[PDB]
Enzyme design. Structure first.
Site, PDB file in Angstrom:
ATOM      1  CB  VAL A  69      54.978  25.273  56.256  1.00  0.00           C
ATOM      2  CG1 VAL A  69      55.078  24.196  55.172  1.00  0.00           C
ATOM      3  CG2 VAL A  69      53.648  26.012  56.192  1.00  0.00           C
TER       4      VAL A  69
ATOM      5  N   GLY B 243      48.717  31.983  64.351  1.00  0.00           N
ATOM      6  CA  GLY B 243      48.391  30.557  64.236  1.00  0.00           C
ATOM      7  C   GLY B 243      49.451  29.706  63.553  1.00  0.00           C
ATOM      8  CB  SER B 244      50.011  26.069  63.709  1.00  0.00           C
ATOM      9  OG  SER B 244      48.734  25.936  64.314  1.00  0.00           O
ATOM     10  CB  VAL B 245      50.765  28.126  58.315  1.00  0.00           C
ATOM     11  CG1 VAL B 245      50.619  27.884  56.820  1.00  0.00           C
ATOM     12  CG2 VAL B 245      50.279  29.533  58.653  1.00  0.00           C
TER      13      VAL B 245
ATOM     14  CE  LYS C  66      47.697  33.092  60.938  1.00  0.00           C
ATOM     15  NZ  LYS C  66      47.488  34.592  60.867  1.00  0.00           N
TER      16      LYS C  66
ATOM     17  CG  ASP D 282      51.623  42.346  58.917  1.00  0.00           C
ATOM     18  OD1 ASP D 282      51.254  43.475  59.252  1.00  0.00           O
ATOM     19  OD2 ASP D 282      52.432  41.700  59.606  1.00  0.00           O
TER      20      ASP D 282
HETATM   21  C1  LIG Z   1      45.838  40.921  63.105  1.00  0.00           C
HETATM   22  C2  LIG Z   1      46.265  41.119  61.637  1.00  0.00           C
HETATM   23  C3  LIG Z   1      45.437  41.778  60.731  1.00  0.00           C
HETATM   24  C4  LIG Z   1      45.848  41.947  59.402  1.00  0.00           C
HETATM   25  C5  LIG Z   1      47.095  41.475  58.967  1.00  0.00           C
HETATM   26  N1  LIG Z   1      47.444  41.638  57.680  1.00  0.00           N
HETATM   27  N2  LIG Z   1      47.517  42.704  57.078  1.00  0.00           N
HETATM   28  C6  LIG Z   1      47.877  42.458  55.826  1.00  0.00           C
HETATM   29  C7  LIG Z   1      48.042  43.526  54.719  1.00  0.00           C
HETATM   30  C8  LIG Z   1      46.719  43.473  53.960  1.00  0.00           C
HETATM   31  C9  LIG Z   1      49.199  43.150  53.784  1.00  0.00           C
HETATM   32  C10 LIG Z   1      48.214  44.940  55.238  1.00  0.00           C
HETATM   33  C11 LIG Z   1      47.993  41.143  55.648  1.00  0.00           C
HETATM   34  C12 LIG Z   1      47.726  40.641  56.848  1.00  0.00           C
HETATM   35  N3  LIG Z   1      47.721  39.370  57.233  1.00  0.00           N
HETATM   36  C13 LIG Z   1      48.395  38.374  56.672  1.00  0.00           C
HETATM   37  O1  LIG Z   1      49.133  38.521  55.687  1.00  0.00           O
HETATM   38  N4  LIG Z   1      48.233  37.213  57.301  1.00  0.00           N
HETATM   39  C14 LIG Z   1      48.814  36.131  56.822  1.00  0.00           C
HETATM   40  N5  LIG Z   1      48.240  34.921  56.708  1.00  0.00           N
HETATM   41  C15 LIG Z   1      49.039  33.979  56.153  1.00  0.00           C
HETATM   42  C16 LIG Z   1      48.616  32.520  55.939  1.00  0.00           C
HETATM   43  C17 LIG Z   1      49.641  31.713  55.106  1.00  0.00           C
HETATM   44  O2  LIG Z   1      51.025  31.700  55.580  1.00  0.00           O
HETATM   45  C18 LIG Z   1      51.987  30.997  54.708  1.00  0.00           C
HETATM   46  C19 LIG Z   1      52.270  31.343  53.360  1.00  0.00           C
HETATM   47  C20 LIG Z   1      51.653  32.418  52.709  1.00  0.00           C
HETATM   48  C21 LIG Z   1      51.978  32.702  51.374  1.00  0.00           C
HETATM   49  N6  LIG Z   1      52.868  31.967  50.714  1.00  0.00           N
HETATM   50  C22 LIG Z   1      53.482  30.934  51.293  1.00  0.00           C
HETATM   51  C23 LIG Z   1      53.202  30.595  52.626  1.00  0.00           C
HETATM   52  C24 LIG Z   1      50.261  34.438  55.809  1.00  0.00           C
HETATM   53  S1  LIG Z   1      50.382  36.084  56.200  1.00  0.00           S
HETATM   54  C25 LIG Z   1      47.910  40.800  59.858  1.00  0.00           C
HETATM   55  C26 LIG Z   1      47.503  40.642  61.191  1.00  0.00           C
END
Ligand SMILES: Cc1ccc(-n2nc(C(C)(C)C)cc2NC(=O)Nc2nc(CCOCc3ccncc3)cs2)cc1
Ligand SMILES: CCCCCCCCO[C@@H]1O[C@H](CO)[C@@H](O)[C@H](O)[C@H]1O
Length: 334
Positions: free
Chosen positions: A27, A30-32, A47, A162
């Site tokens: 989708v 990284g690639s998800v 992910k 994020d």
């Molecule tokens: C290096 C670093 C460290 C911390 C963070 N943070 N900090 C935060 C908060 C805790 C918010 C401050 C959150 C994140 N990280 C984060 O969100 N990472 C994500 N992983 C996905 C996987 C799924 O994608 C598709 C999808 C997801 C959901 N519905 C549909 C499709 C999405 S967003 C970021 C970068």
């Protein structure tokens, strides 16, 4: 006890995932991948972290993202359903997979640049603010809150995340690279999001950085004396002193026909001086959210140790620390 993995092949890479996760569909890099989790019956995002231990920088981000998501346990904040590696030992540890809920949409996909009813705005902003209360109590500033960072299901249930123009939601002090952000930079972003949901229109659509700041100043006025005293930069002090004073606009004349409680909340969010902006805790107690607000169901987090991730370690050390977080992971109950 170790699950059985299968080796498929998507987006030019050998994914190796547990069998529970089926119908992997990519989708976006990284690639998800989207997947279906046969163990919980949920649609999930898996992910695959990119080159997680290629460099010190990658190793740190991997460990920072994993650590922080493991800590985040709140309905309006993204969290981990699962974390896994194919590796059986630290010596073969080279890939990290993260699993979360699949939401289906971000806030733009819900808004379609249209006006939302006042009731829908209440429910959506309430959830953002409730999620920010939690994050901020962990002593974390988001810093990049915007609609594409907000996941929303069909029932308008919202999660802050994020992913890592965007500048449209950014607090003025961030545009200007001040180096002491208070948590209310996120409140600034909430105010910009709320305005746009109410009006159908971007509140500050700057063509560029300077334009963005001109648009902001038009709404909220030029700095007062109290704010000017807080400016340490002499060159910044001088330039602001040289501006033509502009009065703050009356928000009711900008948000015409909105609920006056929405208007009043926007006035408290979008204060130039970040010290004078309403906090997330405060904003949840504002009468605008009378129908949703519950003081006993607005949780806070255990404080989070950010010094662990600000260390200067060898690659192998970050990797061994990331490996430990993978192994200690305990899923939530469902
Ligand atoms: C290096 C670093 C460290 C911390 C963070 N943070 N900090 C935060 C908060 C805790 C918010 C401050 C959150 C994140 N990280 C984060 O969100 N990472 C994500 N992983 C996905 C996987 C799924 O994608 C598709 C999808 C997801 C959901 N519905 C549909 C499709 C999405 S967003 C970021 C970068
Ligand atoms: C265009 C010039 C006006 C922009 C002023 C930004 C107002 C933010 O306000 C400032 O937030 C800072 C956090 O970075 C803090 O250091 C200060 O205490 C606070 O007054």
């Amino acid at each position: 006890e170790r699950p059985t993995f299968y080796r498929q092949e998507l987006n030019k890479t050998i994914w190796e995932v547990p069998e529970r996760y089926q119908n992997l569909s990519p989708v976006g890099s990284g690639s998800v991948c989207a997947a279906f989790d046969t163990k919980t019956g949920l649609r999930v995002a898996v992910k695959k972290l990119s080159r997680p231990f290629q460099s010190i920088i990658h190793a740190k981000r991997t460990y920072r993202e994993l650590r922080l998501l493991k800590h985040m346990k709140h309905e309006n904040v993204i969290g981990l359903l699962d974390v896994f590696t194919p590796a059986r030992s630290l010596e073969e540890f080279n890939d990290v997979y993260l699993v979360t809920h699949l939401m289906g949409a971000d806030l733009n996909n819900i808004v379609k640049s249209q006006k939302l009813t006042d009731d829908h705005v209440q429910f959506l902003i309430y959830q953002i603010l409730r999620g920010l209360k939690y994050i901020h109590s962990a002593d974390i500033i988001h810093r990049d809150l915007k609609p594409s960072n907000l996941a929303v299901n069909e029932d308008s249930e919202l999660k802050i995340l994020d992913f890592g123009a965007t500048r449209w939601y950014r607090a003025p002090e961030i545009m200007l690279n001040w180096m002491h952000y208070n948590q209310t930079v996120d409140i600034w972003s909430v105010g910009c999001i709320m305005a746009e949901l109410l009006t159908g229109r971007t509140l500050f659509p700057g063509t560029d950085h300077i334009d963005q700041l001109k648009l902001i100043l038009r709404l909220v006025g030029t700095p007062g004396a109290e704010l000017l005293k807080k400016i340490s930069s002499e060159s910044a002090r001088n330039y602001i002193q040289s501006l033509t004073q502009m009065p703050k606009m009356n928000f009711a004349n900008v948000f015409i026909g909105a609920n006056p409680l929405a208007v009043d909340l926007l006035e408290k969010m979008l204060v130039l001086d970040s010290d004078k902006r309403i906090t997330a805790a405060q904003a949840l107690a504002h009468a605008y959210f009378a129908q949703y607000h519950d003081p006993d169901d607005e949780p806070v987090a255990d404080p989070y140790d950010q010094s662990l991730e600000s260390r200067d370690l060898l690659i192998d050390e970050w990797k061994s620390l990331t490996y430990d977080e993978v192994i200690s992971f305990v899923p939530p109950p469902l």
